């Protein structure tokens, strides 16, 4: 199942080229600030999936073409990112850096400095958990998303800029991915293919990243783990379009705009 | 004014040795998960300050000894910490602490079991942000500051993971609103382990001053109400062991004591 926020924090299920509105069904308030609707849906999902599946045929269906998809989790407890982590410790990204699949990456105006793209699989945590054993990893994974880990090349602050952590376009629930350790990932800048890899090539694997993170910190429903980027990290400029596709997880494209 | 969470996310005003429950008048829901009640109170405070002042005479007052004070903001958008940042004579820029590290004034610091390694205390003034804001000019700093709390920036000495363990960011015991601190750049701060005074300083000795730390953080990131800025620690950083008690006092801001306990 593919869960998405759209048009001001409405919750939907993505079915083909359409999205069905589950806002009223789930009792989510899109005017809630801070918006924690998707984190509550994630915590309660094993109790609501059946209801969503049983009621879908009655729900309002809008074409994807007619809505503004947003970042699925806008105020996570934390964003944990693994540096490197592909065959040829973790750091934190601020929630404030999150942006959705229709928001531009805004470059800070740093002449003598480049902004690089990083294509990553995101893990969305589904359970409050500490010291998760490797063998138990699937119990605490809600699903997966595409993530761009944008960085000013040279310091925590150079990964911290607003728009430097695009996540989207939806969460694919964990049950809809056969084996997250065999996913093809690809990133284009315009028509140029810059990054291509398989999550089989992860150095510290998904169970290891969850076990490592949970040994230090209580994880929460909504937490994002950025699993790393392969080779082909390179620059973006005003007018570029970054495309990321992860097999079975999803696909998104964002514009790059120079900041004023 | 001193704003507190207690007894599972109830909101209170601290009056001398008592607290008054303001949960109903603020429309807070203590059962809400995630608990964002103090963030909403902070965003709306200039509209609700009058309402709280007017009600105080009518509200029942519980002795502080009879409640459990909690961390005032349990799920901030971010925690921004400035490394070092005191003159000894009275780094990679700011870093981020996970919200998961937050602890209250009645919670113990739990030492991870690291033979060969020590856990150190760091006494710091915390700034609580009051406004959604980006690229704040030094001269407008006062517009975006809600208030102040005491913060312990605990670390395994040697790496981000080293500042990230659960209970390695005690904050409390309440927020003191910015109008109740005449000048936050003149505050005396002390930290004790048991009867031993380890850290003594004044915020007049900050290398990057309060306005600088807000302009710096806000140039990179959109700040949110409830955001915590850890302003740095002076000299006297040192170890804590099972059975230690850490007391932090900051003049005009607050004081808290926590127990230290060896983890499983
Ligand atoms: Mn990365
Ligand atoms: Mn510190």
Among B72, B103, B130, identify where a domain stops: B72
Q: Are residues A210 and A200 in the same domain?
A: yes
Give the Cα separation of B154 and B237 in Å (integer).
10
Q: Strand A115-116 vs strand A151-152: parallel, antiparallel, or unpaired?
A: antiparallel
**Which chain B residues are closer than 8 Å to A218 by Cβ?**
100, 166
Is the domain of B25 the same as that of B78? Answer: no
If asked whether residues B1 and B33 sit together in one domain, one would say: yes
> String of b and e for B20-54 (b: at least 16 CB within 10 Å)?
bbbbebbebeeeebbbbbbbbbbbebeebeeebee
Beta bridge partner(s), residue B20: B13, B61
Q: Does B224 touch chain A (CB under 8 A)?
A: yes
In 3D space, the residue among B67, B17, B80 whose CA is nearest the CA of residue B213 turns out to be B80
Domain total for chain A?
Answer: 2
Closest ligand, as measured to the CA of A164:
1
Cβ of B208 under 8 Å from any chain A Cβ?
no
Chain B residues close to A71, C-beta within 8 Å = none
Can you tell me the distance from the alpha carbon of A198 to that of A182, in angstroms, rounded to the nearest whole number?
Answer: 6
Q: Out of B9, B42, B72, pick the residue that ends a domain.
A: B72
- Cα distance from B132 to chain A (closest Cα, Å)? 11
* Chain A contact present for B161, CB below 8 A: yes
Distance A228 CA to ligand 1 centre (A): 5
Cβ proximity of A79 and A53 under 8 Å: no
The answer on A80 and A28 residing in a single domain is no
B49 shares a domain with B78: no
**Burial of A18 from C-beta contacts in 10 A (0-12 / 13-18 / 19+):** middle
CA distance A117 to B146: 36
Q: Cβ contact (<8 Å) for A156 and B39?
A: no
8 A C-beta contact, residue B142 and residue B177: no
**Best CA proximity match to A158, nearest among A218, A216, A98, A115:** A115
Q: Could you tell me the residue range of the domain that residue A36 belongs to?
A: 1-72
The CA distance from B123 to A258, in Å, is 40
Of B222, B36, B248, the residue nearest B149 (C-alpha): B248
Nearest ligand (C-alpha, residue B155): 2
Q: Are residues B233 and B121 in the same domain?
A: yes
For residues A115 and A189, state if they share a domain.
yes
User: Chain A: residue nearest B134 by CA?
Assistant: A162
* Nearest neighbour of B36 by CB, restricted to A34, A130, A160: A34
Cβ(B128)–Cβ(B45) under 8 Å? no
Nearest Cβ partner of A94 from B36, B100, B221?
B221
Sign for the CA dihedral angle at B39, B42, B44, B50 comes to: positive
CATH number where B226 lies: 3.90.850.10
Instruction: Examine the domain organization and report whether B87 and B155 are in the same domain.
Output: yes
User: B61 with B124, same domain?
Assistant: no
* Residue in the structure block whose two tokens are 């952590």: A165
Q: What is the resolution of this structure in A?
A: 2.2
Are residues A201 and A230 in contact, defined by beta-carbon separation less than 8 angstroms? yes
B101 contacts on A by Cβ (under 8 Å): 217
Q: Do B220 and A77 touch (CB under 8 A)?
A: no
Residue in chain B lying closest to A93 (CA): B96
Given A14, A40, A72, the domain boundary residue is A72
How far, in Å, CA of A221 to CA of A210, rounded? 13
Do B204 and B137 reside in the same domain of the chain? yes
A216 closest CB neighbour out of B40, B165, B224: B165
Closest CA to A81 of A121, A126, A115: A121
- B203 with B138, same domain? yes
Q: Are residues B32 and B120 in the same domain?
A: no
Which residues, 6+ apart, have CB-to-CB distance to B188 below 8 Å? B200, B201, B202, B249, B250, B251
Q: Which experimental technique did the depositors report for determining this structure?
A: X-ray
Are A103 and A254 in contact, with CB atoms under 8 Å apart? yes
């Amino acid at each position: 199942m593919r869960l998405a926020r759209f048009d001001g924090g409405r919750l939907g299920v993505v079915i083909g080229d359409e999205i069905a509105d589950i806002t009223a069904l789930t009792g989510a308030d899109p005017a809630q600030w801070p918006d924690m609707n998707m984190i509550r849906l994630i915590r309660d999902f094993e109790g609501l999936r059946g209801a969503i599946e049983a009621a879908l045929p009655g729900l309002a269906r809008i074409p994807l073409a007619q809505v503004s998809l947003e970042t699925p989790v806008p105020w996570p407890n934390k964003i944990i990112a693994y540096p490197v982590n592909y065959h040829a410790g973790f750091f934190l990204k601020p929630g404030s850096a999150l942006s959705g699949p229709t928001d531009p990456v805004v470059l800070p105006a740093v002449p003598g400095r480049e902004v690089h793209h990083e294509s990553e699989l995101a893990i969305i945590i589904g359970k409050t958990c500490r010291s998760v054993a490797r063998e138990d990893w699937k119990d605490v994974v809600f699903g997966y998303a595409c993530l761009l880990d944008m960085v000013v090349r040279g310091r925590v602050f150079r990964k911290a800029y607003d728009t430097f952590c695009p996540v989207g376009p939806w969460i694919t629930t964990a049950d809809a991915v056969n084996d997250p350790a065999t996913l093809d990932m690809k990133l284009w800048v315009n028509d140029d293919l810059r990054q291509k890899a398989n999550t089989r090539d992860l150095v510290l694997d998904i169970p290891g990243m969850i076990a490592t993170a949970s040994a230090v910190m209580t994880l929460q429903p909504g937490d994002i783990i950025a699993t790393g980027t392969p080779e082909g990290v390179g620059p973006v400029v005003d007018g570029d379009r970054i495309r990321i596709v992860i097999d079975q997880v999803g696909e998104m494209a964002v514009d790059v705009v120079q900041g004023q």
